[PDB]
Amino acid sequence: MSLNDFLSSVLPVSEQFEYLSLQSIPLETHAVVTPNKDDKRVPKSTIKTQHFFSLFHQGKVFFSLEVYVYVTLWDEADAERLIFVSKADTNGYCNTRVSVRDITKIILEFILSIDPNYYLQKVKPAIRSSPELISAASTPARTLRILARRLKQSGSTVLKEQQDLYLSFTCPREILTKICLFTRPASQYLFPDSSKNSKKHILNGEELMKWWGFILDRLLIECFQNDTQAKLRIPGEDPARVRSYLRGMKYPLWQVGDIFTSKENSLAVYNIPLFPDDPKARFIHQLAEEDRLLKVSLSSFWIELQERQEFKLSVTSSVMGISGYSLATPSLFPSSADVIVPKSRKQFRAIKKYITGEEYDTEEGAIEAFTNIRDFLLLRMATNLQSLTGKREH
Amino acid sequence: MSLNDFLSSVLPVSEQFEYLSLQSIPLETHAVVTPNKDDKRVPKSTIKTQHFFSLFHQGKVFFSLEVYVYVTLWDEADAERLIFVSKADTNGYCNTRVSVRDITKIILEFILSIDPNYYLQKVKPAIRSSPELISAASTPARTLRILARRLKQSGSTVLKEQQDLYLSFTCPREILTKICLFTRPASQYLFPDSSKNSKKHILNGEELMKWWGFILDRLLIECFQNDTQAKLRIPGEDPARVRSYLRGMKYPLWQVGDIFTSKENSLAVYNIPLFPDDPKARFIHQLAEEDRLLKVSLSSFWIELQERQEFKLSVTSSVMGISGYSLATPSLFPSSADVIVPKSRKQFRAIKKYITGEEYDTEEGAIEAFTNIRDFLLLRMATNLQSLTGKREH
Amino acid sequence: NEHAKAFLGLAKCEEEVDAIEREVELYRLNKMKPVYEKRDAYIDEIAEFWKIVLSQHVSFANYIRASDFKYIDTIDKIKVEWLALESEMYDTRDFSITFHFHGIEGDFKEQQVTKVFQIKKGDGILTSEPVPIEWPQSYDSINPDLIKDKRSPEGKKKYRQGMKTIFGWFRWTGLKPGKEFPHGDSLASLFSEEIYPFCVKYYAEAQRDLEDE
Amino acid sequence: NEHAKAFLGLAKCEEEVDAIEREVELYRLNKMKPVYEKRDAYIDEIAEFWKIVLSQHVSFANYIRASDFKYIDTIDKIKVEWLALESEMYDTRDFSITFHFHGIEGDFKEQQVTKVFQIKKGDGILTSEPVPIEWPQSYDSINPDLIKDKRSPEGKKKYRQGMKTIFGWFRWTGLKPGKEFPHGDSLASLFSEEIYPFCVKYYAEAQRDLEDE
């Protein structure tokens, strides 16, 4: 079913909401995990995409989520997908009350039902290929000159496009689904200053961790298979300690550890995935500088990460990892109502900043951020949010 | 006994150290606690001073402490002193090993033996009083003009000084000693980047708290009287919870709470003391802005402080408070070897920055910071650190 | 006493360099005047040159409602004039900005506005006097001169709203902190120091071959 | 096609304003030249004018060893010269700084040094060529030209040391990141844009009646 079905299924009945599903343009990028030179299988291609969501109630924004989906291609039909969850945030300016937890879980189900081939149609390459091209390497003078000789010559100032440069791939509808995330609580992630809002409810370290873990537990049951491999990790904690949280998990197979184990290449740099704004990426690059990348075992990596302040002087954070196969076969190219795909980085960023960029120490900003989005989709994109009739009893 | 006696008494024997005791010039300042207009007793004067310390081992700095002493005067012989502890910090560049804990405790004993009348001799007023004065209100042009008419007229360019403007007070050698501090662990307080030093040992929230509490426990016994009032407070914790830490304390009278209780004026702003860089000062001023100063009971203050992130998303922090009378009668005007009193704010700051301002991600800075201090005291002040023959068995 | 000499000297210099800088500044203001003159001339023959520049300049769109762009698109011409050329009575940093809107059918009149910005004593803040302009007929709801009471609960609501469009900028003065348009002085400074002085650099970039700039 | 016209035009302007700025800059460089000339003249009659300015300028003392002040105190004269006046071969931002030390008995010779700073292509970084100077006889221990091996464990030690004095600044070039004097380009820029251009403002402040400024 549609995203629209989903959300409606977890919002109080009779209630009306609106929401935004922005999605970047799938861009061919470098390997999620850092490859090692002399290695049999190194990825053929990595296809990044960003999903960004934001709910609205009564013309105010109150929630937003930022997840990246990465689809890796080793060859003809050896593929693999990874869902990374970067940021979720609220601003406590919702008039009514809702389960942010089920909203988030749902949204992820939905991303989980997506057929990985959706990301495979067009793919903006990492570096593209008769001259006369204006580009980031064209002084204003140059460009103008160009527009001039192109006008004196042709009737107009545009060119020919058939124009196909834009990569294309395929893989098996059912592949290895992964999910990775790093719980860390902060005052706000996507709604600046909203922490200056009283009615905003912040979960602390150990509060976030259970929250998240319930969302993954629910998913491992409903969506993944019974041998799926699930792992938890809590930096600066005891393997006995974790198992005790885990005994709270309805899912049977939750274990201590992570899904990057892999006895093949026992060295951190070639195992740890690298994500936006992630501490894993962080510590990693830290070691790029102080040059220790070819010296820290994955085993060691974990142990060192815990010290070096950050974790040493911050509340409970945990790394969860999933690696299994989905119950149903993911198979959902989303409708125009399911996503909204800006023409460019430029426009994509533009619409996100209408939200993420606003100040929220006053219900003013949340009202602002909503109008400015609908105004804008209508104006520059001939579109508009999705309306929601909430249909969940109690 | 002298500071020099003290430190030597807590450093390993045969071992040699050096240390700096910088002390600001006692400045008449505003009330520690915010006074209320219509109030019978409001302070007559508040006398601030800063003590700053730094130990050296083998021509490297490795520890420094920043404590403020405030002496309040209600009238003729109604006085009161308060020791506030702002910052202590290490950089792990000590070659040998020492009890930073006993170093700190000691240093405080010493400040505790100081006769409050020491701070009472000269006191730079808050606003001083025949013209012709160059001052912060003199353009460079002006000043020059002045130096010119003062030269054409007199043989030189200086003036007359008898010059006595510089306040003077007295109080009873034995007064109400208080001690206040707010434990919060951080990567570094006085040694920038030193957290990039591996060998540097950081205490976490619950680790700092016991550390500090042991230093005060030791003091309440050795230095204070048996009815002294001692209080602990741990934001976001349970009165049962604290009592359980407290049951670890050798001192009998440790209670939950703080020493600002005072049923007289049950309103936060008129009870909470205001210190450098303090969260108490912080939250307070926060409420000055959002205008709630005449609306939050001291009772409420505590309760609200715990939320509003900071504490909500940081490890264990505690507020300790003391209020009693000292065993012995404090009575120690310190020697030139006990303190070093810069001519001015300007020079004082100057010498502190030689340390606090240095980078410490390399033993380079700690070596640097030492030389630059001895070089400088010698040069511009005809002085030099104190040498220490450590005399503590084991 | 040759020391009383040298001191009196420097003091002269000190009062001078203040007026010396006013000179090096008045020079550049003069040099620039006719150059912008030429350029603007060309610009003036380009269609949608300003429409294009304002929608490409990334920072700009932070300051104003998204709806304002329907009207913003109408901007035929933008001229910056530095006042220090027309009388030594003016801060080297004082200037005016003239706009031209070519309006739209049954919603936005065609107009031309000049708001004036000059500094006021106290290191000196930048400030503005209010200037008239015909708000679109859509912005009837949030028009200040269409609101009976701005202190009424639904009146302060709607006022605060229209104060966030670009038209609410034309009222800005920089003397009612928190009461008027937000950052109106920065915006004005944007125009005067970046948008107008580089309007070309941006038009070139918007002219990038391939959707993705 | 009048559009092909206007475009070719702006492009001319674009290549021009680059050379136009070199002009407004060369103007100020010229206006300033003789003014500093007068001033320096006065300064030159004041005793310990420079000694005083350098010890009062707060930021300055961050960059150099504390011991350097015994020698720093000896600084009779500091002159800044912008190279863009002596040949269009020079970046408007290029300049030289001349110092005069009057040395000390049996430790520091009397000398006068001019280090030269100009920018190098690649937005262009500022850089320097090494220039000779007689390090004090105390700085024998940490003298580079007194160290047999800088790669030896006790040699890299002692080298790194003398590289932190002001004399280690005179070697700085801005091409051996991490190897030479720390922030040597910022320091040079300090002199050229703050210390020399305001040397007076600071001397006035150090002249405050009452120990506490």
Ligand SMILES: CC(=O)SCCNC(=O)CCNC(=O)[C@H](O)C(C)(C)COP(=O)(O)OP(=O)(O)OC[C@H]1O[C@@H](n2cnc3c(N)ncnc32)[C@H](O)[C@@H]1OP(=O)(O)O
């Ligand atoms: C890896 C990543 O994705 S990281 C993102 C981390 N983000 C942040 O830290 C941003 C700050 N945190 C937040 O903004 C939010 O608290 C969230 C999104 C983490 C959680 O939102 P919440 O609305 O608090 O949670 P949700 O609405 O699902 O309900 C959670 C619990 O709080 C309760 N709750 C909801 N609102 C409130 C409130 N105002 N006060 C107290 N409790 C509340 C719910 O009953 C529920 O409790 P229960 O389990 O006892 O029924």
Ligand SMILES: CC(=O)SCCNC(=O)CCNC(=O)[C@H](O)C(C)(C)COP(=O)(O)OP(=O)(O)OC[C@H]1O[C@@H](n2cnc3c(N)ncnc32)[C@H](O)[C@@H]1OP(=O)(O)O
């Ligand atoms: C209110 C205020 O004043 S706030 C100031 C807060 N400051 C900071 O947070 C700065 C960061 N913290 C630090 O720099 C330091 O850890 C301090 C000053 C807090 C403590 O210093 P330490 O040297 O760790 O403590 P100290 O030397 O007294 O010994 C403390 C414990 O650590 C042990 N220890 C000392 N060095 C090390 C080391 N490198 N590794 C492990 N343990 C060590 C000691 O044995 C002792 O343990 P014990 O009680 O089991 O005997």
